[PDB]
Amino acid sequence: AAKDVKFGNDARVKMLRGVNVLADAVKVTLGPKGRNVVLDKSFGAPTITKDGVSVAREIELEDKFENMGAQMVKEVASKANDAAGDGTTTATVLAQAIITEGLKAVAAGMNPMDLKRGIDKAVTAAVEELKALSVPCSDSKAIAQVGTISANSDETVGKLIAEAMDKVGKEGVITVEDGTGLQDELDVVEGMQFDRGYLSPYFINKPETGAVELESPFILLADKKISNIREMLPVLEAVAKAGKPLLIIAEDVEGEALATLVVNTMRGIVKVAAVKAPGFGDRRKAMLQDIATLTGGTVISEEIGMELEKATLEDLGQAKRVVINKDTTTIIDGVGEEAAIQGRVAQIRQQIEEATSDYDREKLQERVAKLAGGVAVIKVGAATEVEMKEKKARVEDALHATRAAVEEGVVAGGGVALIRVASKLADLRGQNEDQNVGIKVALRAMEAPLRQIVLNCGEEPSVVANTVKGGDGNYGYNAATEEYGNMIDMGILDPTKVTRSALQYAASVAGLMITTECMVTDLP
Amino acid sequence: AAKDVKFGNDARVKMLRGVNVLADAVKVTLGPKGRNVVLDKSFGAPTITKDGVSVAREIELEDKFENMGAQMVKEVASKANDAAGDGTTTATVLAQAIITEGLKAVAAGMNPMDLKRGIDKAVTAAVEELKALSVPCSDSKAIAQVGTISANSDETVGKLIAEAMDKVGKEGVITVEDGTGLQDELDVVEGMQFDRGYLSPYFINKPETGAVELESPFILLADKKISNIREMLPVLEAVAKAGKPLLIIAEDVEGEALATLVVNTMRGIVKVAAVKAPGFGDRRKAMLQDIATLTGGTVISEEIGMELEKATLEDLGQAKRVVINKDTTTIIDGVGEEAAIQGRVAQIRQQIEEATSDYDREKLQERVAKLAGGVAVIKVGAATEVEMKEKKARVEDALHATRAAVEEGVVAGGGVALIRVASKLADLRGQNEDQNVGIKVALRAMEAPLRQIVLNCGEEPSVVANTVKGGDGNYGYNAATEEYGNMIDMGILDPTKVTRSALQYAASVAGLMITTECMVTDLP
Amino acid sequence: AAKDVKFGNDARVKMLRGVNVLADAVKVTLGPKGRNVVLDKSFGAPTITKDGVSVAREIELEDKFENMGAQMVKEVASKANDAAGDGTTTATVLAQAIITEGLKAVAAGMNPMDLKRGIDKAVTAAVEELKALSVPCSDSKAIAQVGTISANSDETVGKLIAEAMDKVGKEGVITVEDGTGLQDELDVVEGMQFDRGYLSPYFINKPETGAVELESPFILLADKKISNIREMLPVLEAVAKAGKPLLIIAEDVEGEALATLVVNTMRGIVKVAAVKAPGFGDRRKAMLQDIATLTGGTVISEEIGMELEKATLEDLGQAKRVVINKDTTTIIDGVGEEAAIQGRVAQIRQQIEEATSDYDREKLQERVAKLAGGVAVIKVGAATEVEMKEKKARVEDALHATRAAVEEGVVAGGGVALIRVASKLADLRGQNEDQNVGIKVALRAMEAPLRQIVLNCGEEPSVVANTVKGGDGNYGYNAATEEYGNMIDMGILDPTKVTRSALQYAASVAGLMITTECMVTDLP
Amino acid sequence: TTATVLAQAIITEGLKAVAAGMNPMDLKRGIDKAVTAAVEELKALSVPCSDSKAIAQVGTISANSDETVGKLIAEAMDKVGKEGVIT
Ligand SMILES: [Mg+2]
């Protein structure tokens, strides 16, 4: 595939045009009263949505290079959402603002590297200002308070979120399941979650979630990389007859074994998924065993002399539910014996006391938390299935905001916090004039999300922002009610973590584009 | 098919245009303050990188002839990295400068052959100047000193390099393995390295490395060329059943067996790799035997009457690790008995006594080193698996730099060494008037890497080059800190070998283009 | 299909353009300081060579008719290499000069038939001059002298060539084999060479050589034309288990068996080659038998009642090496017993008494020479494979030059010999005025290779040639050292046979083009 | 030629200033004020040219460093006087 190359302004201008298309389309849906965007669907009638993430997902440009601009922003914006749960659209809005003004500066004869440096300094100062601005969240009322707000002013949802965290801790693992009964249920059951993703995007049976949900699946524990389909065949045939899904944990799965399973799973016969074993080197051997004890399974080790091909249902572990997302795997309600698992914890507790290394005490302690802490599950109850499933989405959305709020506290969510920081460091400047311009670009860019909100609502952006500038603290304008006041008090806020992640990611992508002198793509 | 032919000025102009595109894109990332380059992918988003090598690999031009120019530079630049481990971007930078100014000279009516000679004379003088400029690196302090710098100021990485060399030797074999735990472990285990590449690129399971890593594979030793698939089958299925990779050492493998093994390995049945036996004639027979003793394997010889088809696992040697690169084969921790291995060494030591020829004593001595010297292995410790691969990559990069530093010492790495040498031989004149022009071209061209660094840093190339010229020795400008001083003492340097190799290759390709009178290619 | 036909000048002009393209691209690489050419590959990137033959192979033209001219010259030039071993580029150079001046003459309105004939007298007279100019090579000192020069100032290469001839004889059979060790080995072993080509070009396993080399292959001796694949099966299958290549000697092989074997040998199960038997009729029966005794194999005769299907391995002769080129087959180190081989010789020596004619005595004597004389072989010794194989190529070229040198002696190789002869017969005139024109065209065409040499070097051809003409005999200009004197003494010479063959082929092809009224080809 | 160069540098930098968010009318005033100050400095730097050699040097420098032109002109201006006419 032959490549087309553009330099300097020809390159940068195309990125600007590309980013603006993505940004302009996505920006309209940011506010409470945000405007809706029509997306075509290959089969059936066209889709109408107010969600920026959905719109961002659906945008790819005709012109390569312009496409690059949009996509570069999308990758980083997606990361903000993946690390914060919200602000995907906000990051893009901020990215456009920094990028559009920053590019003018490079084309004006000013040095791009200095402009980046000025912007980064502004961003660095802004992050700390956000930290001062931020209202901490630690007590149960604050947990419930943020949870109910996120949940769309439903106090019952906030209560369960706080209760879940209270039962397993702030860092504990909380999952959501369809409710069997009308009543909301919160339960503690043996289970474990670890940072391991799925080996294939093809495996996902829940496309909105992006996660794979399996029902009472068999669990295969392995201690070797799997490159050959042959080891799986006797076990593979056995699971299909059952009709139950099979989950595999091992070092890695190579394309020969994995490709057949991928093909077999997608609209095929036996639909199963495989994930990598948690931990590394020395760490994994103990952890796989922890999972084994938890699911009542048997670990298969090449070192032992036992191979996967010589295996039956007896060796496999079991759990009622398991869900696998892009980079995380969690198991729910493992079958392992209560005495076995509790005993395992006792063995580990004894292990903690050698305390030879701080790293080892903590790491052993970490093992205790995953196994002994268990997994807290929340079933969402409702009168009708339609209401029940809808409520479940809301609970999950509140949970991401609550976790972000816990880690860093909260800030005004109308884009007000960005406004608020910009007013505070207006005086800040750099020795190089180019640096001064970079600082101004970043600060001015911060204003955009507020203005975008107001613009979407059909109100004057300049008038609203000007009055907001006049105020102090968490004071701001709420788009939904057209009334000025403390945004946190009135119910509109964003986690401190999401605002920070969006703003800095936007600056990071912006800085990269500003310094770029060349882009490469294939011919039309 | 029918060919499109250009010759004389027309052929040279296209090469210039082709090389400039390649060089303009790659040159922007050379400095510590490297400019970002965005490389597109057909699916979704573009990528942003400061790595010149990744940029250069990707470049292919639609316009034939121009494409040849770019490719010609890429091949020679690639050779510099292949024989030095670094300077791929630097070679290209120097190549553009030499080629552009010299090429104009040939089109100006100047004799090309003389211009080459003038350029080469300046290049040769510069190489010796580099040798004088170069600071020796023999003691452990120097070994560690260069190793930590290359490792990007990591003192511990330098320490392991120095200690490994201290044991096995400068000429010894040092390899890097993923670490078992937090500590970095260095150990010497029985093993052997020889200069033999892999028969097929398709074999590589580590795409960034360009090498094939196998875990505790069975080893097949053969005394015949393998053109037929069929002999392999009884051993081939047996190894697959065993569940481990198979490594083959023999005279050579033909496409009849090679192509099927490739097909068999890529997304298929069993993934194994094969390499050619070390030495030739008398040497291979003794050398293969040394490997057999080392891996505890059995050699199969046509001359004896033994055949591959009749062989079993017990006839195969074993090692915990084996890695195969483009031109080198090495094995780690051979299973062969200490009594057998050490006893064989005694047999070889005894052989050395005959001293019939310097050639046999030299060669026998070489056998002793490989068989008895052993292999030094370095495990890289880390708190996380991602970090562990990260630290490991850095060690490998440092190791090439240390080996290069050992072989020829080191020079200032800011492009300063090229500057320093160019200034020293300003006076030098050729025979023909045209030759004198070539000399100026070569010397002026040398300036470019420094200027490029400064250009990438947003600083004036002419002003920095001018100040550097004024100073002497290793004195120069550090782009990263915007300061002037002794570049080696400031932690910025390049191995003498990489600087020399990049400068020599740039001149070699440049001269080559200069003397090229005709280009033939397919129509568009 | 409909075809494009053009007449006279229209047909001839296209041939002229075709030959000029081929000659212009090839001629630049003729000199010692020749200019390299860049050719592109489907498989990767471009490679550069100063070798005219490689350039010629890749030259094919867009315009049918022009392509034919180039191909016609390539055809004749290739033949010169085939019958001389060198001067493929020289033949092409001479062809362009003769053709351009002569072809213009036909275009003007001069008689073509006379022009060819006029050129022929020039050529015939020049060849006689070459014979007088030519220094004979008979003694060992001359043999070694030319051999070392051809090898490129390597005394050892020439010394072995002289020694090889000194053993088996000037007309004996000398072959080249890879060296098992450091020492160069020249020795004699039973073997036979005969003039027979390979049935299919597809058979060649050595594309640079254009020949098929096999390792200790089984030899099939047959007494019938082969038309049917079925007979082959029991023996073909037999060689397959053995794993060794199979060589076939028979009257001829038809497409029915030939096509399947060709497909079988390319990307197939058994890779074998087949050639026609030496001699014919009555002579053939004895000739095949001589090979049978030599190989120790059994000849299958239809007349007897023996059939190929009824054959086994014991009926197949063996030799350590066999090599087949475009029209010659030779075997090395036949396994046949010395007692039987010598005994076979005794039968032939006894036969000579029958001699009722000189032809029969001679023909029988020739048989004695092939069998009893044997084949001498050369193993090329070197420190490493790269040097060993590289050295081997040079030895083969020196060998061809020595055979050509022995058969006709040598002439100045700077193109000087053509210059010297052209100056000598300035006076010669034809009958018709048109014939006179042809003579001048041929005599000044002779100059072209010298001038081309000087042109490549970047020196003025007109100036060099004038001074060389002023001199006498072998006196001329050495392009490599920029000096004047005896070219032969200096180290630059061409075999008389190659110079003559190049010149005669150039004139032969030229005359055919001069006399070619019409051209017919496929549509574009 | 020199005047044109000044226009080139003034406008290139001035436009850059315009792109910097500055009021052009003010930029013009700044330029005009700087020029007024520069002229006075020029007035101070200027040294009277009264000798033949200096006049020759200006003629020679103007004539692209041609000595004969300066020599010929210096002789002329001296001979004709201050109000004399040279063509
Ligand atoms: Mg003037």
UniProtKB/Swiss-Prot annotation, chain D:
This is Chaperonin GroEL. It is found in: Cytoplasm. The gene is groEL. The modification N6-succinyllysine is found at K28. Phosphorylated reversibly during heat shock. Together with its co-chaperonin GroES, plays an essential role in assisting protein folding. The GroEL-GroES system forms a nano-cage that allows encapsulation of the non-native substrate proteins and provides a physical environment optimized to promote and accelerate protein folding, probably by preventing aggregation and by entropically destabilizing folding intermediates. It comes from Escherichia coli (strain K12). Forms a cylinder of 14 subunits composed of two heptameric rings stacked back-to-back. Interacts with the co-chaperonin GroES. Can form asymmetrical complexes, composed of one GroEL and one GroES, and symmetrical complexes, formed between one GroEL and two GroES oligomers. The asymmetrical complex is the functional unit. It was suggested that the symmetric heterooligomer may represent a transient intermediate in the chaperonin protein folding cycle. Each subunit is composed of an apical domain that binds non-folded proteins and GroES, an intermediate domain and an equatorial domain that binds ATP and is involved in inter-ring interactions. Forms a large central channel that appears to traverse the entire length of the cylinder with no obstruction. The central channel of GroEL functions as two cavities, one in each ring, that are separated from each other by the crystallographically disordered 23-amino-acid C-terminal segments of the seven subunits. The entry and exit of polypeptide seem to be restricted to the apical end of each ring. Modulating the volume of the GroEL central cavity affects folding speed in accordance with confinement theory. Small proteins fold more rapidly as the size of the cage is gradually reduced to a point where restriction in space slows folding dramatically. For larger proteins, either expanding or reducing cage volume decelerate folding. A stepwise reduction in cage size results in a gradual loss of cell viability. Belongs to the chaperonin (HSP60) family. The modification N6-acetyllysine is found at K28. The chain holds residues 90 to 176 of 548 of the full protein. Disulfide bonds: none annotated.
